[PDB]
Amino acid sequence: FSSLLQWTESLWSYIPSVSLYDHSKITCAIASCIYDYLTEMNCVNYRKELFSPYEKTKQFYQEDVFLLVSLDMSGIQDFIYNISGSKALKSLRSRSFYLETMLESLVDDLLSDLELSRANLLYTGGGHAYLLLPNTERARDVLASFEGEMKEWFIKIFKTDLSVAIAYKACTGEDLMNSNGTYS
RNA sequence: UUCAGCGUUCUUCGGAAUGUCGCGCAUUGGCA
């Protein structure tokens, strides 16, 4: 699917739906999160439970179903500039690339732990990563375990030179729909 | 016919610096 997502983005980047890719990706992520939430709740019929009363569509935008997740890497500039000059030119280019590549790996690992795709990562800042995840208990436990494992690995490799902090917040469909201005 | 000099200019006009370099090399860095 990753190849399909990469293809979709190049083709739909400069065409209106927010471009079409942006919308398609966001839809995919939201869908995956909803599917995981419904699997956690074990609904008998997704369509009937959602569209039957025709008010359940509105109420489902009020159930806490999504998680806004931010993972941030601490120690970027110090790591790039904790160098002696002997190989500075080389080191400075390599350290910045290594830190960005490591951040990519992180989220990929996290996605591999959630069986999700890159559509669920809204964007990656240098040293930063914002994602949208399902609010399932399994996903929450996966996030906790991933935070613990990342803490252990960073302490085992760089000690206090680099760290990673992961924080999540629960939200509903209306929050994603910028109702009442709560999203920002 | 004799007696006398007297007055006016006291320097003038141009050119007033120019061109050339305006730090270099070694260590260091960089490449390997």
Curated annotation (Swiss-Prot):
Encoded in a type III-A CRISPR locus. CRISPR (clustered regularly interspaced short palindromic repeat) is an adaptive immune system that provides protection against mobile genetic elements (viruses, transposable elements and conjugative plasmids). CRISPR clusters contain spacers, sequences complementary to antecedent mobile elements, and target invading nucleic acids. CRISPR clusters are transcribed and processed into CRISPR RNA (crRNA). Belongs to the CRISPR-associated Cas10/Csm1 family. Part of the Csm effector complex that includes Cas10, Csm2, Csm3, Csm4 and Csm5. The N-terminal HD domain has ssDNase activity. The C-terminal GGDEF domain has the cOA synthesis activity. This is CRISPR system single-strand-specific deoxyribonuclease Cas10/Csm1 (subtype III-A). It comes from Enterococcus italicus (strain DSM 15952 / CCUG 50447 / LMG 22039 / TP 1.5). The gene is cas10. The chain holds residues 176 to 368 of 755 of the full protein.
